[PDB]
Symmetry: D2
Subunit: 171 residues, 4 copies
């Protein structure tokens, strides 16, 4: 038998334990087109049709962006774009309204409601019109059978849409 | 009615979605004492008694370290230290053995098994002995009623102990 | 050495593995009062004030119901009731409107929006009025600092309110 | 304007909220073979080779059992069986030892340690031998690239093996 004394310098009294952390993935699409018809006399939208290039997704992370293009997500080879078509604008007051439209993700289509908030109507520097509105709402992955392989535990069924638009008159 | 054109520069076609991520919290205790009796003739431990100062926890994050001291974790005011007392060493061969001891966390005591791996026995520079062994095993939070308020979902019931010792002879 | 043959009848080649499952807790309150003022000429609400007895919660499980009364949930001893006061009804059409009100949970108050859906206005059997409407919306635990000890991982931050009312005229 | 009174009988003041629950999936395999060589003079295993028919899995649920056979789990069409081959038994005492062997799941092979606990050696009714031992240990899905598509969040990386054997002498 013999007696020893730790050498605290080259000793580590260590442990490891696993925990979960919830976090928000934020994202936009860098490339999209839209047709916007709006009547500033009445603060009503008349037509709003958006097309978004799935390839232009950005979640400040190049490897996840790539992964979003694959079979378990968007399938951008087969379905390069997502589209929104307004079907109905129901005015609440001049600042607020309920927008109903058809969202299409990887060829699956559902009618959604977005909350229109008109944050400012103006005549610009040059005397031609501008507008600044937002569109906000929550869609469910499951309504669109989006990423069905991924559990609703790992990744939320709820996606929150925040569309922030500034926009100038035409021609 | 009027027609607008997005100003892509001050437009954000955005979304937010929540996901979970699993991660390992790694940690040690910076301050502890131990009594080590070991027989290099037979590669058997004779006595191993450790006392650890809960206050000296380190998980490379000062606010979590603090939080670990509180009622929902260690309760360092009431129970400043955790202790391990070897009760039995069962040799497998000269490199490996099964250690049984009594672990005490916030005044609750359970007998645990650690896997002893002797990574090297030597006479040092000066002709006085050294040893380098490891102690590894898994304990359950629930066996010790540790952090009972925290769910086994958020934070794993399993803690993995990795004790890495280098140690020199006495007097 | 000797050779054996399993007795499959008293042998179990077994395993255990842990998984998570997401599920909806559904609930109502069995006891509450309300004051309802509604104008069937215009399909507008004028006043809607609800008081709910937290003690009357029902989630088809007596031990959870009890637990909901405690410090980590409602604190029914200190705060026996939750209240909603309408502040604004904004008509969309005769079937739909946006209700804004003040919800109070354990003494914390936030303005919320509920989606009013009028599912049917009538003169009853006896020639006195009835109505059937629904109120739907999502509130965040965190907005009300409700159950702050419970993680948003274990239990969702989002609560979905589904108020389904049938109601007859007064006196 | 008009005043109404709830009809509590056809009113529901309701809510829905999502929570997670952890649970153990328990399972065995109903059909398997083994070769067992054991020396009761010394309480040492000499040979232990097991083959398990993946098709015979049982987790008291027919739809999960089926699902376990598919590409995202066992792939029973391509790999109908899992095998264990003992490579080393290291005696601790007559009741306990450390078994090292090669486990093969869907064609991937890893050396694992199981804790042998001999719960009883005997001469039977007829004067021919019996034994009752258990084999216990933890394996990681990831070590075998098992169910790689399923997250370690949803389903634990750790599987706990509990093999409970009773067994009679040969010929």
């Amino acid at each position: 038998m013999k007696e020893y004394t730790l050498d605290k310098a080259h000793t580590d009294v260590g442990f490891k334990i696993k925990h979960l952390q919830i976090s928000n993935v934020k994202g936009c699409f860098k490339d999209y087109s839209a047709v916007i018809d709006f009547d500033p006399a009445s603060a009503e939208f008349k037509k709003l049709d958006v097309t978004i290039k799935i390839a232009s997704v950005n979640t400040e992370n190049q490897t996840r962006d790539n992964h979003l293009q694959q079979d378990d997500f968007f399938k951008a080879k087969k379905y390069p774009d997502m589209t929104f078509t307004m079907k109905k604008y129901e005015k609440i007051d001049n600042e607020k309204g309920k927008m109903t439209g058809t969202l299409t993700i990887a060829g699956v289509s559902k009618d959604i409601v977005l909350d229109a908030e008109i944050g400012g109507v103006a005549k610009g520097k040059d005397g031609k019109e501008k507008i600044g509105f937002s569109l906000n709402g929550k869609i469910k992955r499951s309504d669109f059978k989006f990423a069905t392989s991924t559990s609703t535990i790992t990744l939320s069924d709820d996606i929150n849409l925040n569309i922030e638009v500034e926009a100038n008159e035409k021609e």
